[PDB]
Amino acid sequence: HLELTEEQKAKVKVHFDECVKQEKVSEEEATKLRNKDYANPTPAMKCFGTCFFEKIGTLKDGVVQEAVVLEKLSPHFGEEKVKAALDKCKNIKGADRCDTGFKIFECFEKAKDEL
Ligand SMILES: CCCCCCCCCCCCCCCC(=O)O
Ligand SMILES: CCCCCCCCCCCCCCCC(=O)O
């Protein structure tokens, strides 16, 4: 799995804070998110995740930004493996913006598991 650099860790925190504010995440929800308590997310947690993927440049208007995903994931996971996950996940649509982002994320997590 990803071993984030110190630069990436700092960016994660910046975008975390941006998305807690933008998606009106409660204090309790924010603490779940910070602790990676992602099971059965609430609606605002799904919006947080969608926001996060937007802010890191990987998702826009429900569309996966493939070059950015590859830039970020290929070095660790393998280019062909990431292209295969893109092929399988990038067209997923959910019930609304936030559910779409959540479902795409879940698909990528499944792809990671299948490694
Ligand atoms: C074929 C490979 C697919 C891999 C999919 C990996 C998805 C990575 C999602 C990571 C989100 C960012 C986590 C930040 C962790 C932290 O520093 O607190
Ligand atoms: C909508 C889901 C997309 C999932 C695949 C996206 C893979 C990128 C995961 C990168 C997580 C780490 C982010 C580091 C901080 C940063 O890039 O700003």
TrEMBL record:
Gene3D superfamilies (UniProt xref): Pheromone/general odorant binding protein domain (1.10.238.20)
A GO CC term assigned to this protein in UniProt: extracellular space
Alphabetical list of InterPro entries matching this protein: PBP/GOBP, PBP_GOBP_sf
Keywords, comma-separated and alphabetical: Secreted, Signal
A GO term for molecular function: odorant binding
Keyword Glycosyltransferase tagged: no
Similarity section: Belongs to the PBP/GOBP family.
PANTHER family: GEO07291P1-RELATED, ODORANT BINDING PROTEIN-RELATED
Protein name: Odorant-binding protein
Native organism: Phormia regina
Gene: PregOBP56a
